[PDB]
């Protein structure tokens, strides 16, 4: 388990790799994989859809059961559920959607959830459809997370740009 290889060290605790997070999760068998979730844990696209498809919808069934007890997650909030075949645990984290005018400060709250886990495989939060600058998101991760975080970035152009910022 936690067989991370081929990562570039950015800080004492933050690593980055140009990788498909699902492919990495299958290879690393991490204790925790982070999902970039919405408040309803509807895993319909992006990283969430890829992770859920890799579990053959087990993640979605379990998420639905969780939401049935909890109701929607709060922006900046998270929940710990099964990682199924991808990890021991999946940390589902909701970053702000700045397209809805949600405060970018809630991205710190979002990354603060990582501090409850000694090692995580994660994507960058609040990028793509959540509209945050991904370089800004990596800055918040680096400033906020004190446990060991291994970031997978799929897009090589984005990866090059992030690495070029350290």
From Swiss-Prot:
Origin superkingdom: Viruses
Membrane topology: Multi-pass membrane protein
Reactions the enzyme catalyzes: Thiol-dependent hydrolysis of ester, thioester, amide, peptide and isopeptide bonds formed by the C-terminal Gly of ubiquitin (a 76-residue protein attached to proteins as an intracellular targeting signal)
Phenotypic consequence of residue 31 to A: In strain: Mu/B.1.621
Subcellular location: Host endoplasmic reticulum membrane
Coiled coil residues, start to end: none
Domain Macro intervals: 1-166
Reported regulation of activity: Inhibited in vitro by GRL-0617.
Signal peptide positions (record): none
Effect of residue 164 to L: In strain: Gamma/P.1
Subunit and interaction comment: May form homohexamers. Interacts with N protein.
Function in brief: Responsible for the cleavages located at the N-terminus of the replicase polyprotein. Participates together with nsp4 in the assembly of virally-induced cytoplasmic double-membrane vesicles necessary for viral replication. Antagonizes innate immune induction of type I interferon by blocking the phosphorylation, dimerization and subsequent nuclear translocation of host IRF3. Also prevents host NF-kappa-B signaling. In addition, PL-PRO possesses a deubiquitinating/deISGylating activity and processes both 'Lys-48'- and 'Lys-63'-linked polyubiquitin chains from cellular substrates.
Protein's recorded name: Papain-like protease nsp3
